[PDB]
């Protein structure tokens, strides 16, 4: 034949750390501590594991087994299972094109912060700057100061009016134009992800070595630093303080379910592609287990890293850790945490390692996020592609750059919130629901347990089988139904989103998966004979 076989992993630890670097990102660092504190406190640990063990782990392991079994991309694997669902592999691609439009610009912000951290005096410390207003009031200033409704801090001014420059846009209506600095930063990032991908899984496992390991070292340094800060016990108390009346609310369980689902990130075909290159007799169980546990515990220690510094901040201000933690989002890291860094000795050091930590946290997850789609299209169009892998990887990277120009405008953050909450999220949950239903109720769970019996030598236990048959599809269905029933009201930076925002996100969300139903109609209209025979060739593998 022309091309006999595909590649594999250079070492077990390389992909073992590659899937972990994929699963570990900013959300583990910030999103989990906040949602853990405001819901139940430490008591949030109980439902977070239940939604993991029952909901998250069977989707992570079921997603990870099919990749190491079929060794096909996100697209070509459906031709071998349920060809009518092949559009899933395309939908994810389109979905990826939306996700890459924002998720990289955050690292662009962290990079603009990193290159601005090389000065002996950090820019967000002092209030004398070209971008600051008269409302700017900092510390090392006159005492007795009282905050005003219109007053703003120099870190808030630095993020708002300088790097983001969001004061130059009135909202989603007029966000123009584009900022060139963040365009250069995101160009450097699209360059650093290019050289970590283009050579295939060889470099993506080697570059992961640095990107996965560094955030843990930085979290250790920031943990020892935050533990020595006075009054840090307030953020730890507010973090672990049990509230058992929260478990009675039906909302916090849905929050934990969505949090663990997105934190593990199954059903996107990334784990499918990472498992596609591996040994056939290699163990899926121990891998998925260890990786998931490492991710969750990483979020757990990230909680301490955040809340020691926020407790020190609530000690420098007056208590009420919910007040300094009021804002949930990048402003917690880029304003609150950063302003807490500027007040500490060796502030240049702790700022550099912090922003570098953020960049390393997003970079590996981006490596894998592109790796699943690139593997999907290369496996779907073999030998018509792979003529050069760097050609296709570059063709994807540049397209993602032009797709991120909408996010690089002055009002880009609004588009970040809109795309993440109202568009990408519900469609990723949706396509993951279609996959969980398709593998269990079409290809069958018994044949899946037989394939696991072939790879591992033994059939999976009844605990996992009963999870794939029932618990997991209802686990995603609960989240999708909860979101569609009551979409949350979006607010960012003293600005409320228009009522039609949900129309736009849905319009962007629906336009991603338009391909799967029209593809089902494509194979339904293409296959001759009776519709039962067409759906028989569609149900039976090829």
């Amino acid at each position, epitope marked *: 034949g022309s091309q006999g076989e595909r590649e594999t992993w250079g070492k077990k630890v390389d992909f073992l750390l590659s899937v972990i670097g994929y699963a570990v990102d900013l959300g583990n660092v910030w999103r989990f501590p906040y949602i853990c504190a405001q819901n139940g406190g430490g008591a949030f640990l109980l439902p977070y594991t239940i939604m993991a063990i029952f909901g998250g782990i069977p989707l992570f392991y079921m997603e990870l087994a099919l990749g190491q079994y079929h060794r096909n991309g996100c697209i070509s694997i459906w031709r071998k299972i349920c060809p009518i669902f092949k559009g899933i592999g395309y939908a994810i691609c389109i979905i990826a094109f939306y996700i890459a439009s924002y998720y990289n610009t955050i690292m662009a912000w962290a990079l603009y912060y990193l290159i601005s951290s090389f000065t002996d005096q950090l820019p967000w410390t002092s209030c004398k700057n070209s971008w600051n207003t008269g409302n700017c009031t900092n510390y090392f200033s006159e005492d*007795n100061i*009282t*905050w*005003t*409704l*219109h*007053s703003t801090s120099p870190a808030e001014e630095f993020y708002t009016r300088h790097v983001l420059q969001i004061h130059r846009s009135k909202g989603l209506q007029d966000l123009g134009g584009i900022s060139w600095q963040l365009a250069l930063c995101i160009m450097l990032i699209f360059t650093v992800i290019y050289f970590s991908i283009w050579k295939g899984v060889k470099t993506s496992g080697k570059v992961v070595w640095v990107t996965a390991t560094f955030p843990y070292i930085a979290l250790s340094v920031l943990l020892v630093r935050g533990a020595t800060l006075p*009054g840090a016990w*307030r953020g730890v108390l507010f973090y672990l303080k049990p509230n058992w009346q929260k478990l009675l609310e039906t909302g916090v369980w849905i929050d934990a379910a969505a949090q663990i689902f997105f934190s593990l990130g199954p059903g996107f075909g990334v784990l499918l592609a990472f498992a596609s290159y591996n040994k056939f007799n290699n163990n899926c169980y121990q891998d998925a287990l260890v990786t998931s546990v490492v991710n969750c515990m990483t979020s757990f220690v990230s909680g301490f890293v955040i809340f020691t510094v926020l407790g020190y901040m609530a*000690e420098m*201000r*007056n*208590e*009420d850790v*919910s*007040e300094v933690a009021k804002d949930a989002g990048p402003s917690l890291l880029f304003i609150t945490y950063a302003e807490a860094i500027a007040n500490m000795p060796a502030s240049t050091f702790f700022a550099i390692i912090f922003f570098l930590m953020l960049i390393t946290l997003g970079l590996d997850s981006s490596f894998a996020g592109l790796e699943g789609v690139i593997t999907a299209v290369l496996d779907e169009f073999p030998h018509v592609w792979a003529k050069r892998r760097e050609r296709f990887v570059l063709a994807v990277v540049i397209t993602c750059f032009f797709g991120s120009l909408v996010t690089l405008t002055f009002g880009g953050a609004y588009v970040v919130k809109l795309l993440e909450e109202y568009a990408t999220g519900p469609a990723v949950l949706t396509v993951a629901l279609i996959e969980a239903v398709a593998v269990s109720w079409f290809y069958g769970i018994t044949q899946f347990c037989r394939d696991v019996k072939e790879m591992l030598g033994f059939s999976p236990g009844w605990f996992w089988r009963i999870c794939w048959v029932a618990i997991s599809p209802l686990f995603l269905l609960f989240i999708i139904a909860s979101f569609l029933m009551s979409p949350p009201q979006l607010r960012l930076f003293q600005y409320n989103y228009p009522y039609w925002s949900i129309i736009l996100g849905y319009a962007i969300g629906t336009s991603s998966f338009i391909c799967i139903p029209t593809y089902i109609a494509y194979r339904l209209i293409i296959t001759p004979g009776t519709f039962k025979e067409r759906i028989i060739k569609s149900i039976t593998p090829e």
Partner: antibody, heavy 119, light 108 residues
Framework: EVQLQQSGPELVKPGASVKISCKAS????????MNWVKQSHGKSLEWIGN????????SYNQKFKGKATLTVDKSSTTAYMELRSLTSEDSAVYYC????????????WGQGTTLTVSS | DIVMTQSHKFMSTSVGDRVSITCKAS??????VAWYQQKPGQSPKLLIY???YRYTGVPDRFTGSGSGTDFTFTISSVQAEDLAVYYC?????????FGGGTKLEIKR
């Protein structure tokens, strides 16, 4: 010359509603939170809730949730508090007081409003 | 929520005597406490804010101290116009709560 001038006393039958105003002067009205404190006869002070005059952003107390409603008018720089479902417990002296964002304290108070709910 | 507990509902003192009022809170308040003075028939007047600090227009004879759950409001020279009801309040956590109040009666 910061002055908060409230309305006069009110006598209302139980089950009715009542509205009390606050007229702020001597300071920039958009710079500070406006608050209302209920003081029962012989009892201590009780914080009802505040409001942001710029957008009128309301922050209430869980005890007063569904009880008092706060509004604001920037044209006349005047704050309002409305009470529905009046009972004998609602008879008390009410105040409107200015407060900053931080540290949170009541620097200037209104002269007070004596409310009597009876038939 | 937060419970500001004033154990002494009434305290006796004489003109010129040094008087102090204690304020017991629920949890650890750090430095955030406010002392208000309400004269009979008048609206409350802010005296002390954030532990030791004094508000503008407050005479030097009024002081405050303590960092913790317990706080102390101290008056050195008591005058005849110093007769009023004193309150302590925590401004950190929502909602803001007040103590039971301590009515200071003058002995002569």
């Amino acid at each position: 010359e910061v002055q908060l001038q409230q309305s006069g006393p009110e006598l209302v039958k139980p089950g009715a509603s009542v509205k009390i105003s606050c007229k702020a002067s001597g300071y920039t009205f958009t710079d500070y939170y406006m608050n209302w404190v209920k003081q029962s006869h012989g009892k201590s002070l009780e914080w009802i809730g505040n409001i942001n005059p710029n957008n009128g952003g309301t922050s209430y107390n869980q005890k007063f949730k569904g009880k008092a409603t706060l509004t604001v008018d920037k044209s006349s720089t005047t704050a309002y508090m409305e009470l529905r479902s009046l009972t004998s417990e609602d008879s008390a002296v009410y105040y409107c007081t200015r407060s900053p964002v931080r540290p949170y304290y009541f620097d200037y108070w209104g002269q007070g409003t004596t409310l009597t709910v009876s038939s | 929520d937060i419970v500001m507990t004033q154990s002494h509902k009434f305290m006796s003192t004489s003109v010129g005597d040094r008087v102090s009022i204690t304020c017991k809170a629920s949890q650890d308040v750090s430095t955030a406490v406010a002392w208000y003075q309400q004269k009979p028939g008048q609206s409350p007047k802010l005296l002390i804010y954030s532990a030791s600090y004094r508000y503008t227009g407050v005479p030097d004879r009024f002081t405050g101290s303590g960092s913790g759950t317990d706080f102390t409001f101290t008056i050195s020279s008591v005058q005849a116009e110093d007769l009023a009801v004193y309150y302590c309040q925590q401004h950190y956590s929502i909602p803001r709560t007040f103590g039971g109040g301590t009515k200071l009666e003058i002995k002569r």
